[PDB]
Write a protein that binds this ligand. Structure first.
Ligand code: HEM
Length: 152
């Protein structure tokens, strides 16, 4: 669990993301693929994207980014109470896409990195700490649900 003040910090930084989901999503995804290209193979859709510049120019990729961030944000706003929200995602990653927890750890890394590149002033040791926990809480919940469905 997280304290109330930790959630406030998560939520306080989330509001900044909210002023530019599209812009934040793209950085996040680019970062992820760039640092861990093997994750790129899960996306047949994006696989042909050769450079950054081209990643950046892709409408598809940017629309995907907003989707990813939108679901995430909905989860965080629940401060722990997100089973309803979370379930569809575990179901699909266990059953359809097969995304390993490890991949979820790399994406959390990319998130942290972006938030810090964009909002250093609202992203200190204390917030960063809080965000980490929040993302770890999601990953742990996901992990359990995955197992209940038969997927590592
Ligand atoms: C914060 C973590 C993430 C969130 C909230 C998230 C959310 C979503 C959402 C909401 C969708 C659309 C519906 C669905 O297919 O279930 C999706 C699709 C997908 N996700 Fe993620 N995702 C996350 C991380 C990842 C990671 C780390 C990977 C692995 C490399 C991944 C691979 C995919 C793929 C391949 C699809 C199919 C999308 C498409 O083809 O339209 N996702 N994700």
């Amino acid at each position: 669990v997280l304290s109330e003040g930790e959630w406030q910090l998560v939520l306080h930084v989330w509001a900044k993301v909210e002023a530019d989901v599209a812009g934040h999503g793209q950085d996040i995804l680019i970062r992820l693929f760039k640092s861990h290209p093997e994750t790129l193979e899960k996306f047949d859709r994006f696989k042909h994207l050769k450079t950054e510049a081209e990643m950046k120019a892709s409408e598809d990729l940017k629309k995907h980014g907003v989707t990813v961030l939108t679901a995430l944000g909905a989860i965080l706003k629940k401060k722990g109470h997100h089973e309803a929200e979370l379930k569809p995602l575990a179901q699909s990653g266990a059953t359809k896409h097969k995304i390993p927890i490890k991949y979820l750890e790399f994406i959390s890394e990319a998130i942290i990195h972006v938030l810090h590149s964009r909002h250093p002033g609202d992203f200190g040791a204390d917030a960063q700490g809080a965000m980490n926990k929040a993302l770890e809480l999601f990953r742990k919940d996901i992990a359990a649900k995955y197992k209940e469905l038969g997927y590592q």
